[PDB]
Amino acid sequence: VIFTEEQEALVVQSWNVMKKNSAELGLKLFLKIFEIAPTAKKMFSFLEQNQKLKGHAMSVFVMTAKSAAQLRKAGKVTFGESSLKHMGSVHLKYGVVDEHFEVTRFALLETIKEAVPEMWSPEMKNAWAEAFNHLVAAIKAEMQRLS
Amino acid sequence: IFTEEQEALVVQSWNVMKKNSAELGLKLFLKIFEIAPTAKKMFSLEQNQKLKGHAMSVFVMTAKSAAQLRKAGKVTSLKHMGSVHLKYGVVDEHFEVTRFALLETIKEAVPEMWSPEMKNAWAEAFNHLVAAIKAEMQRLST
Ligand code: HEM
Ligand code: HEM
């Protein structure tokens, strides 16, 4: 797929600003997830500032920004050895459905809009959205590859 | 149990929203399909649609619940509600996304009045209504 250099810079530069507040931005991300769909808590076996709840939210942030660089360099999302199968196996094992990915995307954009209020743009969201969509498509491709 | 103070919060706020109920229905499903676009697959062009009339039902049946929960203590068609939602696979995630979008339409849309008790009033009225729908949804083989 095609991913312009401006879309890459929008994600990289905005993530460079959010790197220091990534911990607090992780808790707020899951606060909106658990506010929109509280049943999402059941998939996580882990009091209110839970470290693996932030560490998972950390991953959603950092892997999405890393995805934007791959979409510009090669045009696809590439995972490493024993990593693509792990992503698919875990999300499949806990029954992550499309609604969970799409609520997380909505909450992610809401956490990127309230973090940097003066960087966001109708072009900024599409950069983070496509980077998040291609990342989910790769996770879902390995989940649907258990034939 | 549903206190009289919680009833007044819903009844009075809905009286203001009665005139804008039509547009408030489209706004409810616009946020639903924005948060979880896969919800469209459960339904069947979509400018003005019967999805607004369906969203009308979500609005009007929730307001009816607040009056019923205060008058009698229960939500009072029920067999049809459970049967339809069961056949299309409406899960808990769908009910709570609709609740979030509903509350965003009751506090952030055109009704500009809000309170820590106002949201909880519509939330409990929506929960007891959904609990009754879900009680009839568990009328499957298990
Ligand atoms: C682009 C989106 C996502 C990415 C990049 C991502 C990434 C990850 C990573 C790195 C792990 C850790 C695996 C391990 O440590 O073995 C994980 C586990 C997990 N993820 Fe995701 N995830 C995403 C979306 C989601 C969504 C939407 C849900 C559901 C709300 C979800 C639920 C889980 C669960 C339940 C686990 C396992 C936690 C545990 O082992 O206790 N993930 N994910
Ligand atoms: C929360 C997520 C919900 C989803 C995803 C959902 C979905 C659906 C779907 C797909 C139908 C079938 C429509 C048709 O085939 O014509 C339906 C029917 C209906 N829904 Fe819901 N529903 C939800 C909640 C509610 C709530 C809270 C109410 C109000 C109490 C409600 C009121 C109705 C009514 C009255 C019908 C009857 C339609 C008919 O008889 O043709 N729904 N719903």
Residue numbers in the entry:
A (entry chain A): 7 to 52, 60 to 160
B (entry chain B): 8 to 51, 60 to 91, 96 to 161
Reproduce passages from the article.
Phytoglobins (Pgbs) are plant-originating heme proteins of the globin superfamily with varying degrees of hexacoordination. Pgbs have a conserved cysteine residue, the role of which is poorly understood. Due to the very high O2 avidity of Class 1 Pgbs, these proteins generate a tight and slow binding of O2 well suited for O2-dependent nitric oxide (NO) scavenging in low O2-containing environments.
In this comparative study, we investigated the role of Cys86 in BvPgb1.2 by generating an alanine-substituted mutant. As a result, the direction of the side-chains has different orientations as clearly observed in the proximal His, which is almost in a perpendicular position compared to the proximal His in the WT. Even though this possibility cannot be dismissed for BvPgb1.2, it is evident that the substituted cysteine did not contribute to increased monomer content. Thus, since the oxidative state of Cys86Ala is pushed toward the inactive ferric state, fewer radicals are formed in the reaction with the peroxide, ultimately leading to less activation of the possible substrates in the peroxidase reaction.
